Amino acid sequence: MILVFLGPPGAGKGTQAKRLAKEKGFVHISTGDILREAVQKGTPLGKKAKEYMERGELVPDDLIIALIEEVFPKHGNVIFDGFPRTVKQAEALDEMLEKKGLKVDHVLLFEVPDEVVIERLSGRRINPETGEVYHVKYNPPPPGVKVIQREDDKPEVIKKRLEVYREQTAPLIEYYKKKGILRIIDASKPVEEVYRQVLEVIG
Ligand SMILES: Nc1ncnc2c1ncn2[C@@H]1O[C@H](COP(=O)(O)OP(=O)(O)O)[C@@H](O)[C@H]1O
Ligand SMILES: Nc1ncnc2c1ncn2[C@@H]1O[C@H](COP(=O)(O)OP(=O)(O)O)[C@@H](O)[C@H]1O
Hints:
There is one protein chain. By secondary structure, this protein is α/β, with parallel strands linked by helices. The protein has a single domain (1-203), classed as 3-Layer(aba) Sandwich (Rossmann fold). Helix content is 50%, strand content 15%. It contains nine helices and seven strands. The protein has helices spanning 13-24, 31-41, 44-54, 61-71, 87-99, 114-122, 155-169, 171-177, 191-202, and strands at residues 2-6, 27-30, 78-81, 106-111, 124-126, 133-135, 182-186. The chain has a five-stranded parallel sheet with strand order 2-3-1-4-7, sandwiched between helices. A two-stranded antiparallel ribbon has the order 5-6. One adenosine-5'-diphosphate binds at residues 9, 14, 31-32, 35, 52-53, 56-59, 64, 82-85, 89, 161. Keywords: ATP-binding, Cytoplasm, Kinase, Nucleotide biosynthesis, Nucleotide-binding, Transferase. Its EC number is 2.7.4.3. Catalyzes the reversible transfer of the terminal phosphate group between ATP and AMP. Plays an important role in cellular energy homeostasis and in adenine nucleotide metabolism. One of its GO terms (molecular function) is nucleoside diphosphate kinase activity. It is found in: Cytoplasm.
């Protein structure tokens, strides 16, 4: 089974993908997590990607498509979390999968309004020791636990990221709807309720 989680930044895709991977054994492929690691390590990918991410822009397709080929697992169920983000990426994914005898089985669209996106992103915090993700209101870090705020979660970069989502990523809704594999998730609900909906959709 291959899943794609699609939706605006802050919708809760990483939160749900992490949970699903941990409990049900999916391979979690987060392009964001992988890129942030590349940047921190200063790899050729990381050095090239870094400034796109800093500015809230998408990293060029060729680099991301190569990254996906590098990390796609030989066996196992997969959650694509934050990939594809463009039509070209989606077309490449279909082609890659077909060569492996696979296909995207479900695309889960995490619907949330812009007001919620901003609330979610502005309050997002990370434990730099473990990578655990918190929210200042909805899931605060334990007392005494040091956390950081991503530079791309600052107000002006959130704005750009949302514009980029609407311009480049949103056309994937129709792309996958035409293939009949798009499932709607009401991502505005609490984490537990969203998770039950994810489980229901994937059966
Ligand atoms: N259903 C939810 N309700 C409230 N807060 C959430 C929910 N899902 C995620 N969050 C919080 O919102 C922020 C964004 O979640 P995240 O999973 O990182 O979104 P995405 O990967 O779609 O960008 C995080 O701070 C997370 O703790
Ligand atoms: N599939 C992709 N294609 C191009 N750029 C990407 C992709 N995934 C992640 N990025 C880059 O990494 C940044 C952070 O992505 P991500 O962690 O997925 O954001 P969010 O937490 O909002 O889902 C993006 O704003 C973009 O610059």
